[PDB]
């Protein structure tokens, strides 16, 4: 907890005060981008941890070491790559309109709130339903981004542990 207050050294949030005709992102866009990056980083941490030491999914070949995985993935299973790309494209397209409106303050959709509740959770009452767990998600996502950066840096220089 960095003082339990907005931690913005270099003040990247405040530049929305200068209109700049919409050149500078509004805080909502940055918030949504941060949550996206955190979620991607945590799932990528799971992937790195397992694939680096893992039997790998039963399938054609699929012998990889987490750094050469994507070319092997594309070559061995073209249909799989095709459907992955198509599904991600569909998901991004369904949203994105709201993200486009989120560059300004016209998002109309709470940042990072997508229609994904496979298990209903209306228990929370404080602010946004269980706002505290939203903070938990963002925190572990920040840490996951740190972890992805750490593995990528350890790649070139054995930076640490």
């Amino acid at each position: 907890e960095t003082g339990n207050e907005p931690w913005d050294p270099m003040g990247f949030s405040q530049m929305y005060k200068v209109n700049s005709l919409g050149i500078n992102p509004h805080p909502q866009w940055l918030q949504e981008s941060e949550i996206k990056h955190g979620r991607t980083a945590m799932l990528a941490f799971v992937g790195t941890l397992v694939i680096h030491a893992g039997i790998h999914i039963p399938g054609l070949d699929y012998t990889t070491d987490w750094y050469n995985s994507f070319p092997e993935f594309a070559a061995k299973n073209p249909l799989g790559l095709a459907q992955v790309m198509a599904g991600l494209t569909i998901w991004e397209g369904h949203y994105g309109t709201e993200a486009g409106l989120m560059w300004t303050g016209e998002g109309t959709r709470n940042p990072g709130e997508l229609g994904f509740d496979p298990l209903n959770l209306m228990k929370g009452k404080s602010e946004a339903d269980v706002n505290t767990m939203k903070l938990k998600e963002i925190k572990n996502g920040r840490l996951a981004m740190i972890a992805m950066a750490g593995f990528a840096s350890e790649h070139f220089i054995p930076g640490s542990v």
Binding site: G115, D117, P118, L119, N120
Partner: protein, 149 residues
């Protein structure tokens, strides 16, 4: 079971009830036909060399090689395409899930009888889906025939 409201996930939120109920009805009807198409072919075989001793576990692939499956796919796909606006509109005023017409001449006018018949259809169709899942899985796992064991 009886007077039991399950929906443990609670999917009504962020969803259209009429859409899901129409989906349920179509699934149910096709699964009932699936159960009887499982049962009958073994006892009774359509005339023709192609339709002889194909077996039910291996029916799909063999008939895909031959004409039949493509034909039935074409006709069912045509009917499904024809039925697009009914699903897309999701209008309450529009006919409730299931065809409003084509009902046999012997359909009770009483609203209570309509509810009873619709409930019977839904229950026997849910049994259909469960029954076919068991049937095909036990068909592939075990031997062949109506017992599937």
């Amino acid at each position: 079971p009886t007077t039991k409201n399950f929906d443990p996930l609670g999917l009504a939120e962020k969803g259209d009830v009429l859409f899901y109920r129409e989906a349920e009805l179509k699934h149910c009807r096709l699964a009932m036909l699936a159960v009887v198409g499982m049962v009958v072919p073994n006892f009774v075989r359509l005339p023709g060399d192609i339709y002889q001793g194909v077996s039910v576990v291996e029916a799909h692939n063999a008939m895909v090689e031959k004409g039949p499956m493509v034909q039935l796919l074409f006709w069912l796909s045509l009917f499904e395409i024809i039925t697009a606006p009914l699903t897309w509109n999701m209008q309450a005023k529009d006919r409730e899930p299931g065809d409003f017409s084509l009902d046999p001449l012997g359909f009770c006018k009483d609203p209570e009888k309509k509810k009873r018949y619709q409930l019977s259809e839904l229950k026997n169709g849910r049994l259909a889906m469960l029954a076919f899942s068991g049937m095909i899985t036990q068909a592939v796992l075990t031997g062949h025939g109506f017992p599937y064991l």
